[PDB]
Amino acid sequence: AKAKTRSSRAGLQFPVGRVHRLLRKGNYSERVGAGAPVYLAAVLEYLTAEILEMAGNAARDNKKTRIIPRHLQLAIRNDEELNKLLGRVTIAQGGVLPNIQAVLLPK
Amino acid sequence: AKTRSSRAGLQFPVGRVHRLLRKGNYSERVGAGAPVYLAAVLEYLTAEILEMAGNAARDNKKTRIIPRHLQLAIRNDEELNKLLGRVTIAQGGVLPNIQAVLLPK
Amino acid sequence: DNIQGITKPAIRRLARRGGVKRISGLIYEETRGVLKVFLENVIRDAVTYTEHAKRKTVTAMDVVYALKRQGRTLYGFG
Amino acid sequence: RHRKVLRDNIQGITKPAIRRLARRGGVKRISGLIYEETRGVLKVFLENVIRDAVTYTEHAKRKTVTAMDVVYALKRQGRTLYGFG
Amino acid sequence: PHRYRPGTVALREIRRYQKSTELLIRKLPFQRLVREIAQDFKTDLRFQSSAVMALQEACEAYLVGLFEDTNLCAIHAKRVTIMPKDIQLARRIRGE
Amino acid sequence: KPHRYRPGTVALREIRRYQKSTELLIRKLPFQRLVREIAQDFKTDLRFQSSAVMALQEACEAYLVGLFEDTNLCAIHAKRVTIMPKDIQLARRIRGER
Amino acid sequence: RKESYSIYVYKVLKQVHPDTGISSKAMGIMNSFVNDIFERIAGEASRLAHYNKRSTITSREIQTAVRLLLPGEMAKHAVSEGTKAVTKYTSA
Amino acid sequence: SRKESYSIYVYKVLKQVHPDTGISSKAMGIMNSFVNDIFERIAGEASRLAHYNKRSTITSREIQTAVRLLLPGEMAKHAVSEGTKAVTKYTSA
DNA sequence: ATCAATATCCACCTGCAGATTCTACCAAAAGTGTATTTGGAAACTGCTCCATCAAAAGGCATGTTCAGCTGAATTCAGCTGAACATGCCTTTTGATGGAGCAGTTTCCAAATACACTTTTGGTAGAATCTGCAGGTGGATATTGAT
DNA sequence: ATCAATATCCACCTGCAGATTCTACCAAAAGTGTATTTGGAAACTGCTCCATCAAAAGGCATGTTCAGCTGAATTCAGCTGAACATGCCTTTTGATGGAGCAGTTTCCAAATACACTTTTGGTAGAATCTGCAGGTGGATATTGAT
Ligand SMILES: [Cl-]
Ligand SMILES: [Cl-]
Ligand SMILES: [Cl-]
Ligand SMILES: [Cl-]
Ligand SMILES: [Mn+2]
Ligand SMILES: [Mn+2]
Ligand SMILES: [Mn+2]
Ligand SMILES: [Mn+2]
Ligand SMILES: [Mn+2]
Ligand SMILES: [Mn+2]
Ligand SMILES: [Mn+2]
Ligand SMILES: [Mn+2]
Secondary structure (H helix, E strand, O other): OOOHHHHHHOOOOOOOOHHHHHHHHHOOOOOEEEEEHHHHHHHHHHHHHHHHHHHHHHHOOOOOEEEOHHHHHHHHHHHHHHHHHHEEEEOOOOOOOOOHHHHHHHO | OOOOHOOOOOOOOHHHHHHHHHHOOOOOOOOOOOHHHHHHHHEEEEHHHHHHHHHHHHHOOOEEEOOHHHHHHHHHHHHHHHHHOEEEEOOOOOOOOOHHOOOOO | OOHHHHHHHHHHHHHHHHHOEEEEHHHHHHHHHHHHHHHHHHHHHHHHHHHOOOOOOOHHHHHHHHHHHHHOOEEOOO | OOOOOOHHHHHHHOOOHHHHHHHHHHOOEOOOOHHHHHHHHHHHHHHHHHHHHHHHHHHHOOOOOOHHHHHHHHHHOOOOOOOOO | OOOOOOOOHHHHHHHHHHHOOOOOHHHHHHHHHHHHHHHHHOOOOOEEEHHHHHHHHHHHHHHHHHHHHHHHHHHHHOEEEEEEHHHHHHOOOOOO | OOOOOOOOHHHHHHHHHHHOOOOOOOOHHHHHHHHHHHHHHOOOOOOOOOHEEEEEHHHHHHHHHHHHHHHHHHHOOOOOOOOOOHHHHHHHHOOOOO | OOOOOOHHHHHHHHOOOOOOEHHHHHHHHHHHHHHHHHHHHHHHHHHHHHHHHEEOOOOOHHHHHHHHHHHHHHHHHHHHHHHHHHHHHHHH | OOOOHHHHHHHHEEEEEHOOEOOOHHHHHHHHHHHHHHHHHHHHHHHHHHHHHHOOOEEEEHHHHHHHHHHHHHHHHHHHHHHHHHHHHHOOO
């Protein structure tokens, strides 16, 4: 009886089984379907991939090997849809975007 | 027989609140006193808003509370206005309020 | 064309209820713009609920859920 | 051992710190009355958050405010904080 | 012939419409607009009457609140006339 | 005549400096004393997880920076470059804080 | 068979204003208000019990949720009414 | 004393998208916060969806609808594509 | 239009604090088998909603006149930014000691489960009576000579 | 400012259509009685982590001087937006008729749940690996006097 993981069967990195247990015990519904954990894990993995891509690119712009919170803030705020999705979120140690109102510049 | 709402000295339905707690996917279990407590709180808030809205209806020569009276009761009460600060009362209108700088001198 | 059905007198009545005494001539078109955006954002979500229920009729409850999900809870239609 | 009673600590939010905060917010010039005003709003904000955090702490029958209590208090106030869970 | 001064009738309209609660946009154009916008998201939709009514109550309440904030922005800059910049400032501060 | 920058140059330079960095701008210990004093006014003999104070400080500074951005927009709206309490009041009223 | 709070709201109205009525639309707004507050309190109590690894919502979770959700004086009155109802229920 | 997090999966995705990039402790904490937040948003909307339609089961359909409600447009289409692909590969394989 | 003064930015470099990899145990996920729930399709029904037509009322589009508001221009006193000396208190790292959080076991009050009875809340039509057109008269506010 | 003329708004009133309240039936929800299980609190510890303070070095807060430039105050006209009269067309109101969608019941395959057993991926802690902070030095861009 050979063991394969659901994350392998869905071609995913995120843990399908853990997401299933977390749905099954979070008092979300009486029952949970077989494909809901796969779908949710895939969506979470995709969003993680997008933010990691843009933050790593920001880290490479700064000649840095490790992503730090500042790179995540730069990736989030400079992307329209990411900034929309996290419009009420605070990134600790992220700072803000460089932005000076034109009327404040010397005349 | 006797109903739980009668035994709690309440008008709001204790049994219905318990069923709605058990069926809303809130927790695996619901305690005996949680529906009583929740029904009491809901009845209290209803009593507050109905009292103030009836006073508004009687100021308006009216026998029946209408949405306008509920809007007036809510917005003229600071804590009700806080609790319903992002709530829209359909057909409620707004409070009469003209900025002083717009009034004639 | 159809967005122009929101006539200048109606936008003026809306501003009056909001306490406005004097209105610039460009405001009307600006208002139409924002109204369209608002309506779009609400209707999209409403339609999504309608599609999830395998219905072809937008119900008042769909609109109520769309409004609550956007932080603008509406009373009186449930 | 016990600390001396804490008093008037809102004055620890010094004018230079408020200036740095405004600078990060893009402010070039600050009226002299802003600082006390800022302290006022800050205290209100802090009060509300701590009030909710302590409430969670009291519900867990704990005597230690945890980072999770603060995170839950911020989330319930619409100010989700990342990085402390 | 009698002629009120500019601003008097505006104030009278402010009082009248802040005193009443009826909807201020004509129903038929709003209904056509709602159906057109919905068409761009999904085709061949029907609409509950209460759904259109609720959409209009929400839209008018939103616009009235936005006009209050816009008026405050116009007054902030020491004038009494709301301009597109007032609406834009109000929407930017609201989070829109 | 010793060197003297004109009013605004150093302010703009500080804007650039602090908009590029992410360190906390309020001193750690005074903020901790303020937090503990307020909590003491809510419930006595409370202890604090070390990360709880840091979370409170990150949240407070982010909130104040955002409020100062909105205050700057309110000051500029009225054709001036100096933020006043009236700007903060307008921004807070529009945000829903009032 | 559609469910609402209408009869209970009307009974409370007759308590506070014996000779005052209510319009259909105002009653609908009443029902919306009751459902909204119910959902707020129940959701906060759910999250409270979950944060503390409790599978049971009790009067304690409801009390804490009411303290979190309502403004101060209103919260104190609502807590008083909930406690009073629970004590009369226990003794009844 | 055994705490679970998403850290290893996030790191595997990071090595996918940037083989030569690392991540700091605090940034990992932020990423875990992000994953948990999005999980809660999607699961709560799916719960409410199933309850609105008197269904006792959260299925792939509720998750899809919640994703369409929660994400901005193009990001929503992308996430729907990846979720659908994952479910279809899961069923047949 | 330069030139001195100052700040910003770039490239280098190394040690260690922080990040990553390694390791092995075990909780949790997977496999299996059985029990329980449910989705959905097939046939059926009755409201809703949309299509369509028609009259007519009132609200809107338009043009005209002008009052007054907004924007520009100007001027000035004082406030706020720049720079510096001075000294304190914050930061960093660690010690000490105990408070309180977390792991574990035991067992009862409280919750769930189930079969059956009693009560109740929803609904539609009848009965009741309030709120609304559409009028008047009086109070109040506005506007123009003076 | 008073005084007359004019327009608007509010409070009243009647007649009655329509909305609300009252009434009675019944399917479904709550209540009841009894049996059984179980979550979590109470007690007991074992350590993690927090409170508080200590030293010392330097970063930063504070007060002061002074002057540049900003906010505030003011003036004035042009041209924008308000107010109003007029005519028409869009919306509103009313009626009729079907199709089409929203619900509804039932039954069987399919999907999901759950207990038991087996396996392994995930974790904590130890060991290993490394980028980047924190220094120096030089080039370069900016700023302000002149
Ligand atoms: Cl403008
Ligand atoms: Cl001010
Ligand atoms: Cl309980
Ligand atoms: Cl599924
Ligand atoms: Mn105190
Ligand atoms: Mn102890
Ligand atoms: Mn009955
Ligand atoms: Mn009338
Ligand atoms: Mn147990
Ligand atoms: Mn100026
Ligand atoms: Mn292994
Ligand atoms: Mn460096």
